[PDB]
Amino acid sequence: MQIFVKTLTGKTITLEVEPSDTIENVKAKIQDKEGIPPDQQRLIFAGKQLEDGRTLSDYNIQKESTLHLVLRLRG
Amino acid sequence: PKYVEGVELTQEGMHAIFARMGYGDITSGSIYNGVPTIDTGALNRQGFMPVLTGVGPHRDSGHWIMLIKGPGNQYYLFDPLGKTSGEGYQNILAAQLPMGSTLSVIPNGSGLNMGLCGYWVASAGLRAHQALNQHNPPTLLNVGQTITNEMRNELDHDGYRKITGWLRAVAD
Ligand SMILES: *NC[C@@H](*)CC(=O)OC
User: Fold this and answer.
1) Domain ranges of chain B
2) How far apart are CA A38 and CA A22, in angstroms?
């Protein structure tokens, strides 16, 4: 299924995922498309931070749900 | 912690501090792994964009700068490290802008960043947006010189501790 990931830089990107995918899987999928290591990603859905071990279905992420991505980066 | 680490604003914290100062939802940019991400639409609407640069898979800590929309086709880059440092990213960012536009590096002096790029971007950054967009704009030399002056007046009389006190506060 298709979900959206939106960043604080305004990029929206689509991903193809299973509801049984862990959050860590999703991060690996972001590493592959965007080159960002899972190390650098905090993920968030309905103001909840998402734990690496839980699945997308653990949070009721439907088809066409929008996650938010924040990167652990500073200047 | 989400917003500030030591004295360095995070991606999350730069959003936060702008929202607190009353700018609504501000979109930022990045250059990550040599690759920019600039939302030209948002730069337009907002009039400016803080951009985090020199980060990547092996660098958590880079440099904040400010993209500024002037009137007409004109854009500006403010690097708190100064003009020379700002020239480094001038070409790659000018190539991200809408067709026919220009990018100029605000000519402020070096030796005043002091580790505080993110704070400078959020204060002086905005005061330069204002200046270049006002009724009778000063020249681009005046703007750069003025900013240099503001940075050093603000550091005077124990200014460093005051600014870092404020970044600490903002972390809570
Ligand atoms: N991230 C802190 C910004 C200041 C800086 O770029 O140090 C060289």
Assistant:
1) 1-172
2) 12
Residues 28-47 of A with CB under 8 A from B: 35-37, 40, 42
Q: What is the DSSP secondary structure assignment for residue A42, as one 8-state letter?
A: E
Which technique was the structure solved with, according to the deposited record?
X-ray
Chain A residues in contact with B41 by the CB 8 A cut-off are 10
Of A11, A70, A74, the CB nearest to B60: A74
C-alpha span between B131 and B143 (Å, rounded)? 7
Q: What is the rounded distance in angstroms from the CA atom of residue B32 to the CA atom of residue B125?
A: 21
CB atoms within 10 A of CB B51: 28
The DSSP output letter for A50 is P
Q: Judge whether B51 and B66 are in contact, CB under 8 Å.
A: yes
Sort out which chain B residues have CB atoms less than 8 A from A44's CB and list them.
none
